[PDB]
RNA sequence: AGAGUGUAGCUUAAACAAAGCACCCAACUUACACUUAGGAGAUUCAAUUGACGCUCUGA
């Protein structure tokens, strides 16, 4: 009851969420590789170590894969390969901490991988949706 | 513009229509007791190995962090502006690109056969 | 109060070849391959193989093998790259060919009036400059060849002092993207080296702190 | 004839019992407590005890769970507690460990259903 | 009208100025454990305990009885470690545990229990049944 | 290092994916799991702006 | 060379004992997370007092 000292004992909305340098905007991490399983395992390791370091992770998603056909014209020969792309979004990594972060990532990086790390841009987000030609 | 843009389907999360045929099915060779025991022992040994790996990873990263912070606080005590200069970010360090290791090093003089490539993707 | 401030760069070359797996790692890899082939589903190869074997079985009462044999022969014909170089490990210690499995770092021949020491390159800092400035100044001075050493951080990584009067060097880290070994005749004996024989080589205790600081991995 | 605390329909533990079983399995040990609605224990069992731990391989496997169950059923029907109650979560009940535990207890001779209170 | 809170209000130790860094209850069981320990902790407001609890005196319960023997804890733990490591080194217990077929001698367990720590459990049972409060007041 | 490479195929209903070698333009070699039991694929080159260089590599 | 310190990573836990948390492998999960089923750990030595390890303070 309001008058009594027990007021406000039950409220929880202020606990739960309502809905310069050393402040790094939302960064994106692309991982391209021929092995979908290797890509997934590396992304899983990254997500687990991020959770361990208590660094925030917005979301992780897969970009549309793509298959490429290669043909040798000495005589005509054909072959095909696939390429898979994973993406992670992070934020809040400290300045000096980002150094060791990226360094450990590079060190534990396995073969058959290409990793890019950049600032999150609307271009990346709009490159996921179908390229509707009507517009 | 106000329409909810669709998302390109991922071909990895879509089982090919030609994967449900019942003609593929293989006979399943029942496992032996000793082989299953070997499998379980292998799994637990590898779990131990991985936890030791992450233990030494923790140690390395903690040592690196504490040493970096010692250097940082010494620089702060000595030069009260260069520590802020170091804490400042820098844009050229955000965009990185790197490759992974290789099963073998590049050959000094090796040319591949003459061919071309072509990407194939759908909406 | 005679002081002196130095900046230094430490480039870490990552290896290009995978580290040779532990026997346990290789055995569990074989086990994973076994489990994967056990749980796997049919592919076009298995389809055509089994179907044409059954076709042959039918025709007897009434190729994939050729392709895989040809592929095996092509594999045997082709030659792979070298991993370890016994000669280059000794006579070309100042080379990349000796070790492609683990990360590398260099060391320079430095001399001081008070004590001659085998240490990592450094340079003197002046006021109108950043420590990273001194770092790229040192690399541009001591490179003497075509190679770029890209940075990975602005924060300080090492702090090491010594008295005679007082000198204080701060170490930054950097990445090694390219590198050659031209101008082989040098005063400073630059040598790409790993942590083990680095520790075996050099004496100091500030350097021992460098040892425990640098990641072994 | 006693009165059990009927109510608390909104909260998960239903206090309408006389003797409750509470199982706590950690990542190191496993214990089972038979207590009264007062919150005061009447009998206990735990893998932490040396008598039970010396005979066992692991303090946390299904074997440990069913062994604690059998020992606790022995203690219960020694202490006269032939009826008792157990409020598990969905996954806690679906687990094979607790399933085999309660099966061991039932075959030991204790049912996890308490009689219906009398008064006419 | 308002009044100050007598005791320290709950959920006051946490900081809300920083909320995302904080760790969250990711398990009903964690929340339940927290709740049980909170409930067993005392509080200044009126609660279930001070109505439906026996209201045991805060003073000690007098018992001039047989004290425990002086057992050398060092060699006790040493022998226990020897026993547990011998058991772990044994070979059949692995398959026994991983196939869920093992058991234990009930008689031996009972004997070792009543020798080691039976008396405490029996004291608990007695004070439950009310023998002590009725006999020795 | 490379430790998270060897892994279980985190997917249900996966066809045969056998290990195979892949060679880039520089001769660098890597592993990739591929459908049929190949032994190596190789990446070719198509186009540079030098017309005389294109003609020379076509001759040789 | 001198000062401090000292339970597995954390906990001023210590009888009925080395407890709880943290952590790791596998499965579901796009992934994380939950959950299930499994995995390893220690108070350095002699009687709170000394002597083996740790940090700091000097050359």
| CA D56/CA D52 separation, integer angstroms | 7
CA D54 to chain centre: 22
Q: Which of residues 5-34 of F touch C (CB under 8 A)?
A: 5-9, 13-17, 19, 21, 27, 29
State how far the Cα of C18 lies from the Cα of C117, in Å rounded to an integer.
Answer: 34
Of all nucleotides, the one whose C1′ comes closest to residue F8's CA is G26
E111 touches strand G (CB under 7 A): no
Is residue F54 one of the residues assigned to a domain?
no
User: In chain C, which residues have their Cβ closer than 8 Å to the Cβ of B24?
Assistant: 41-42, 46-47
**8 A C-beta contact, residue F6 and residue F33:** no
As a whole number of angstroms, the distance between CA F58 and CA A98 comes to: 49
CB contact under 8 A, B64 and C216: no
The DSSP result for chain D, as a single string, is -PPP----TTSSS----SSEEEEEE-SS-EEEEEE-TTS-EEEEEETTSHHHHTT-S-SSSHHHHHHHHHHHHHHHHHTT--B-EE---HHHHHSHHHHHHHHHHHHHT-BS-PPPP---
Using CB atoms within 10 A of its CB, is residue A5 exposed (0-12), middle (13-18) or buried (19+)? middle
Q: Is residue F50 part of a domain?
A: no
Q: Give the number of residues written for chain F.
A: 60
DSSP letter string over chain C? Answer: --EEEEEEEEEEBPPSBPPPPPHHHHHHHHHHHHHHHHH----HHHHHHHHHHHHHHHHHH--HHHHHHHHHHHHHHS-PPPS--HHHHHHTSSSSTT-SSS-BB--EEE--SS--EEE---EE--SSS-HHHHHHHHHHHHH-SS--EEE--SS--EEEEEE--EEEEEEEEEEE------S---SS----B-HHHHHHH---HHHHHHHHHS---
Please give the Cα distance from B4 to A130 (Å, whole number).
11
How far, in Å, is the CA of E74 from the C1' of nucleotide G51?
A: 19
Domain count across chain B: 1
State how far the Cα of D71 lies from the Cα of E121, in Å rounded to an integer.
14
Query: Is-contact A49 A88, C-beta < 8 A?
Result: no
Distances (CA, A) of C111 to C40, C122, C164, C165: 63, 12, 14, 16
> C1' nearest to CA of A52: which nucleotide?
G23
Structure tokens at D38: 């007062």
**Residue D35 corresponds to which tokens in the numbers above?**
């207590």
Token pair of C23 as six digits? 């026997």
D 4-63: CB within 7 Å of strand G? 26-29, 48-51, 53, 57-58, 60-63
Asked whether the beta carbons of A93 and A55 are under 8 A apart, the reply is yes
Q: Which of C122, C176, C177, C175 is nearest to C152 (CA)?
A: C175
Report CA torsion sign: B46, B51, B55, B57.
positive
The spacing between the Cα labelled CA in E68 and the C1' in G50, in angstroms, equals 30
The Cα–Cα gap between F32 and A32 comes to: 13
- What residues of F are in contact with residue B49 (Cβ under 8 Å)? none
For C149, other C-beta atoms within 10 Å of its C-beta total 22
Size of interface A-C (CB pairs under 8 A): 24
> In sequence order, which residues have a C-beta less than 8 Å from that of residue D65 and are 6 or more positions away?
D25, D30, D97, D98, D100, D101
Q: What residues contact residue C25 under an 8 Å CB cut-off, 6+ apart?
A: F6
CA C35 to chain centre: 33
Distances (CA, A) of E118 to A98, B34, C125, D21, F38: 57, 42, 75, 20, 70
- Angstroms from F60 CA to nearest CA on chain C: 21
Burial B21-52 (b: 16+ CB within 10 A, else e): eeebeeeeeeeeeeeeeeeeeeeeebeeeeee
Task: Return d(Cα F4, Cα D88) in angstroms, integer.
Answer: 38
Helices (H), chain A: 36-53, 95-108, 122-126
Q: Is F48 at the interface with chain B, CB within 8 A?
A: no
Whether E102 CB is under 7 Å from strand G: no
Whole-number Å distance between alpha carbons of E87 and D95: 27
Q: Check F10 against A40: CB less than 8 A apart.
A: yes
Number of neighbouring beta carbons within 10 Å of residue C27? 15
Count the domains in chain F.
1
Q: Is the CB of E61 under 7 A from strand G?
A: no
DSSP per-residue string spanning D56-85: -S-SSSHHHHHHHHHHHHHHHHHTT--B-E
Which of D31, D5, D7 lies closest to D18, judged by CA? Answer: D5
Using DSSP bridges, classify how beta strands A27-33 and A114-119 pair: parallel, antiparallel or unpaired: antiparallel
Q: Which of C17, C184, C195, C197 is nearest to C94 (CA)?
A: C184
List the structure tokens of D45. Answer: 């069992």
Tell me the C-alpha distance between D4 and D10, whole Å. Answer: 17
The closest alpha carbon to C93, from C187, C168, C198, belongs to: C198
What is the span of the domain harbouring residue B31? 8-106
Q: Which nucleotides of strand G come closer than 7 angstroms to any CB of the protein?
A: 15-41, 43, 59
Rounded distance, CA E9 to CA B3, Å?
49
Enumerate residues 6+ apart whose C-beta is below 8 A from A108: A45, F1, F2, F3, F4
CATH of residue C128: 3.90.79.10
Residue of chain E nearest D88, judged by CA positions: E29
Residues 14-33 of F with CB under 8 A from B: 15, 21, 23-31
> Helix (H, G, I), strand (E, B), or coil: what is residue A53?
helix
* Residue environment code for C28-63, b if the CB has 16+ CB neighbours within 10 A, otherwise e: beebbeeebeeebbbbebbbebeeeeeeeeeeeeee
Is residue B87 assigned to a domain?
yes
A77-108: string of b/e by CB count within 10 Å (b at 16+)?
A: eeeebbbbbbbbbbebbebbbbbbbbbbbbbb
Cα D35 to Cα D12: distance, rounded to the nearest angstrom: 17
Three-class SS of residue B11? helix
Beta strands F40-42 and F18-23, pairing class? parallel
The alpha carbon of residue D57 is apart from the nearest alpha carbon of chain E, in Å, by: 6
The residue behind tokens 């070994």 is C181
User: Cα–Cα distance between E88 and C188 in angstroms, integer?
Assistant: 58
Q: Which of residues 1-40 of F touch strand G (CB under 7 A)?
A: 7-8, 10, 12
Q: Under a CB-based contact definition with an 8 Å cutoff, are residues C160 and C206 in contact?
A: yes
Q: Are C191 and C136 in contact (CB under 8 A)?
A: no
Is C212 within 7 A of strand G by CB distance? no
DSSP B45-91: HHHHHHHHHHHHHHHHHHHHHHHHHHHHHHHHHH-TTHHHHHHS--G
Of residues C136, B64, B96, the one with CA closest to residue A102: B96
CA–CA separation, B63 vs B76, rounded Å? 20
* Strand, coil or helix: E103: coil
Q: Assess contact for E93 and E99: CB atoms under 8 A.
A: no
**Dihedral angle over CA of E116, E118, E120, E121, nearest 10:** 150
Beta-ladder partners of B36: none
CATH number at F38 reads: 6.20.130.20
Q: Nearest CA to C81 among E2, D78, B114, B110?
A: B110
Return the sign of the alpha-carbon dihedral for residues B88, B89, B90, B93.
positive
Residue of chain A whose alpha carbon sits nearest to that of C157: A96
Q: Which residue does chain F place closest to A69, by CA atoms?
A: F43
> Measured between alpha carbons, how far is C197 from B47 in angstroms, rounded to an integer?
31
* Separation in Å: G58 C1' and C52 CA: 85
Backbone angles phi, psi at D5, to 5 degrees: -70, 90
Angle at E81 between CA E79 and CA E84, to 5 degrees: 110
d(CA D105, CA D70): 6
Residues 6 or more apart in contact with residue F40 via CB below 8 angstroms = C74, C75, C78, F20, F21, F22, F23, F29
Expressed as residue numbers, the domain containing F21 is: 1-44
- The structure tokens listed for C119 are 């240490």
CA–CA dist A115, A106 (Å, integer)? 9
Write b or e for each residue in D14-32: b if 16 or more Cβ atoms lie within 10 A of its Cβ, otherwise e. Answer: ebbbbbbbbbebeeebbbb
User: Could you tell me if C120 and C8 are in contact, meaning their C-beta atoms sit under 8 angstroms apart?
Assistant: yes
Helix (H) / strand (E) containing F51: helix F51-59
H-run or E-run covering E128: helix E118-129
Which run of H or of E encompasses B38? Answer: helix B33-78
Strand partners, C5: C168
Domain hosting residue C205, numbered range: 92-216
Using DSSP bridges, classify how beta strands D20-25 and D85-86 pair: parallel, antiparallel or unpaired.
parallel
Chain D residues lying within 8 Å of E102, measured CB to CB: 56-57, 63, 67
Nearest to E35 by CA among D13, D23, D43, D94: D13
Please give the biggest Cα pair distance in chain C. Answer: 104
How far does A17 lie from chain B, in Å, by closest CA? 26
Provide φ and ψ at A78, rounded to 5°. -130, 155
Say if E28 is an interface residue toward chain D (CB within 8 Å). Answer: yes
The answer to whether C167 and C161 are in contact (CB under 8 A) is: yes
B63 at A interface, C-beta within 8 A: no
User: Do chains E and F touch, with touching meaning 3 or more CB–CB pairs less than 8 Å apart?
Assistant: no
Q: Tokens for C174?
A: 């950097």
Whether residues E109 and D71 touch (CB distance < 8 A) is answered with yes
What phi, psi does C21 have (nearest 5°)? -65, 155
Give Cβ neighbours of residue C152 (< 8 Å, ≥ 6 apart): A99, A102, A103, B93, C173, C174, C175
Instruction: Look at residues E110, C56, C200, A119 and name the one whose alpha carbon lies nearest to residue D75.
Output: E110
CA neighbours closer than 13 Å in the CB half-sphere of residue A43: 27
Question: Which CATH number covers residue B28?
Answer: 6.10.250.3440
d(CA E45, CA D15): 22
- Pairing, β A27-33 against β B96-99: unpaired
Q: Is the dihedral of CA A34, A38, A44, A50 positive or negative?
A: negative
Integer Cα distance of B113 and F45 in angstroms: 8
Distance from the E51 Cα atom to the nearest Cα atom in chain D, whole angstroms: 11
Paired tokens of C38: 């056990």
Q: Are A43 and A66 in contact (CB under 8 A)?
A: no
> How many C-beta neighbours within 10 Å does residue C112 have?
11
Mutate to test the interface with B, among C23, C82, C126, C213 (most CBs of B within 10 A): C213
Strand G contact with B118 (CB < 7 A)? no
Last residue before each gap in chain E (C to N over 2.5 A)? 53
Q: Which residues contact D54 (CB under 8 A, 6 or more apart)?
A: E80, E83, E84, E87, E112
In the block, residue with structure tokens 């991020």: A50
Please give the method by which this entry was determined.
cryo-EM
Q: Which of E122, E135, C101, B6 is nearest to A133 (CA)?
A: B6
CA of D109 to C1' of G10 (A): 43
Q: Residue A111: its chain B contacts at CB < 8 A?
A: 100-103
Using a threshold of 3 CB pairs under 8 A, tell whether chains C and D touch. Answer: no
Q: All domains of chain D, ordered by start, with CATH? A: 1-119 (3.30.420.80)
Q: Report CA(C1)–C1'(G41) in Å, whole number.
A: 51
C-alpha distances in Å from residue D43, one per residue of A54, D40, E116, E133: 42, 9, 16, 19
Which residues partner with A80 through β-bridges?
A69
Establish whether the CB of E84 is closer than 7 Å to any nucleic acid atom in strand G: no
C-alpha to C-alpha distances, B122 to A64, B11, B106, nearest whole angstrom: 9, 10, 34
Please count the other Cβ atoms lying within 10 Å of the Cβ belonging to residue A13: 7
Q: Please say whether the beta carbons of D74 and D108 come within 8 A.
A: yes
């Amino acid at each position: 009851y309001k008058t009594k000292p027990t007021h406000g004992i039950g409220k929880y909305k202020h606990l739960i969420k309502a809905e310069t340098d050393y402040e790094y905007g939302v960064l994106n991490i692309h991982l391209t590789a021929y092995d979908m399983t290797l890509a997934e395992s590396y992304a899983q390791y990254v997500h687990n170590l991020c959770n361990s370091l208590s660094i925030k992770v917005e979301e992780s998603y897969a970009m549309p894969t793509k298959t490429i056909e290669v043909l040798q014209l000495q005589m005509l020969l054909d072959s095909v390969l696939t390429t898979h792309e994973r993406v992670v979004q992070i934020s809040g990594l400290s300045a000096t901490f980002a150094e060791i972060f990226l360094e450990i990532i590079q060190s534990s990086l396995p073969e058959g991988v290409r990793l890019s790390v950049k600032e999150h841009t609307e271009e990346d987000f709009k490159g996921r949706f179908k390229a509707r030609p009507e517009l | 513009e106000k329409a909810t843009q669709e998302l390109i389907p991922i071909e990895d999360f879509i089982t090919p229509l030609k994967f449900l045929d019942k003609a593929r099915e293989r006979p399943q060779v029942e496992l032996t007791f000793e082989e299953t025991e070997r499998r379980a022992l292998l799994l637990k040994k590898w779990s131990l190995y991985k936890q030791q790996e992450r233990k030494m990873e923790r140690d390395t990263i903690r040592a690196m962090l504490e040493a970096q912070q010692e250097a940082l606080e010494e620089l702060q005590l000595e030069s009260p502006k260069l520590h802020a200069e170091a804490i400042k970010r820098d844009p050229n360090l955000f965009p990185f690109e790197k490759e992974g290791p290789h099963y073998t090093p590049p050959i000094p003089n090796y040319q591949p056969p003459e061919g071309r490539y072509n990407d194939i993707t759908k909406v | 109060s005679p002081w002196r401030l130095l900046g230094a760069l430490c480039l870490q070359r990552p290896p290009v070849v995978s580290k040779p797996l532990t026997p346990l790692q290789e055995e569990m890899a074989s086990l994973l391959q076994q489990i994967e082939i056990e749980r796997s589903l049919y592919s076009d190869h298995e389809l055509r193989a089994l179907d044409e074997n059954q076709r042959l079985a039918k025709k007897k009462a009434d190729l994939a093998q050729d392709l895989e044999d040809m592929w095996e022969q092509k594999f045997l014909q082709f030659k792979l790259g070298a991993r370890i170089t016994e000669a280059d490990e000794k006579n070309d210690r100042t080379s990349l060919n000796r070790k492609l499995d683990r990360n590398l770092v260099l060391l320079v021949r430095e001399k001081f009036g008070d004590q001659d020491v085998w240490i990592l390159p450094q340079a003197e800092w002046q006021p109108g400059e950043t420590l990273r400035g001194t770092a790229e100044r040192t690399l541009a001075t001591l490179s003497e060849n075509n190679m770029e050493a890209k940075f990975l951080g602005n924060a300080p990584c090492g702090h090491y002092t010594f008295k005679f009067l007082g000198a204080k060097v701060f170490f930054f880290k950097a990445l090694l993207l390219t590198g050659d070994f031209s101008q082989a005749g040098n005063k400073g004996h630059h040598v790409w080296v790993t942590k083990d024989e680095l520790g075996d080589y050099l004496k100091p205790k500030y350097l021992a702190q460098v040892r425990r600081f640098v990641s072994d991995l | 004839v006693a009165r059990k605390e009927r109510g608390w329909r909104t909260v998960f533990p239903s206090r309408e019992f006389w003797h409750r079983l509470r199982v706590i399995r950690t990542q190191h040990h496993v214990e089972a407590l038979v207590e009264h609605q007062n919150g005061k224990v009447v009998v206990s069992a735990s893998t932490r005890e040396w008598a039970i731990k010396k005979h066992l391989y692991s303090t946390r496997n299904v074997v440990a769970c069913e062994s604690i169950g059998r020992v606790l059923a022995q203690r219960c029907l020694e202490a006269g507690i032939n009826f008792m109650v157990y409020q598990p979560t969905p996954w806690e009940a679906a687990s094979d460990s607790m399933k085999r535990l309660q099966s061991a207890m039932t075959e030991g001779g204790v049912v996890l259903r308490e009689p219906q209170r009398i008064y006419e | 009208r308002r009044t100050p809170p007598l005791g320290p209000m709950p959920n006051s130790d946490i900081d809300l100025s920083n909320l995302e860094r904080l760790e969250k209850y990711r398990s009903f069981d964690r929340y339940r454990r927290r709740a049980e320990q909170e409930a067993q902790a005392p509080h200044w407001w009126r609660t279930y305990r001070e109505y439906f609890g026996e209201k045991t005196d805060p003073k000690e319960k007098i018992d001039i009885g047989l004290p425990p023997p002086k057992v050398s804890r060092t060699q006790q733990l040493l022998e226990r470690k020897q026993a547990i490591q011998e058991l772990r080194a044994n070979v059949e217990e692995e398959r026994a545990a991983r196939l869920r077929t093992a058991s234990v001698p009930l008689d031996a367990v009972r004997a070792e229990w009543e020798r080691t720590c039976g008396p405490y459990h029996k004291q608990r049972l007695a004070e439950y049944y009310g023998l002590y409060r009725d006999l020795f007041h | 290092s490379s430790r998270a490479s060897l892994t279980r195929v985190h997917r249900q209903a996966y066809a045969r994916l056998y290990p195979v070698l892949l060679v880039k333009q520089d001769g660098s070699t890597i592993h990739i799991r591929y459908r049929e039991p190949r032994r190596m694929l190789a990446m070719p080159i198509d186009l540079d702006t030098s017309p005389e260089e294109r003609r020379a590599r076509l001759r040789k």
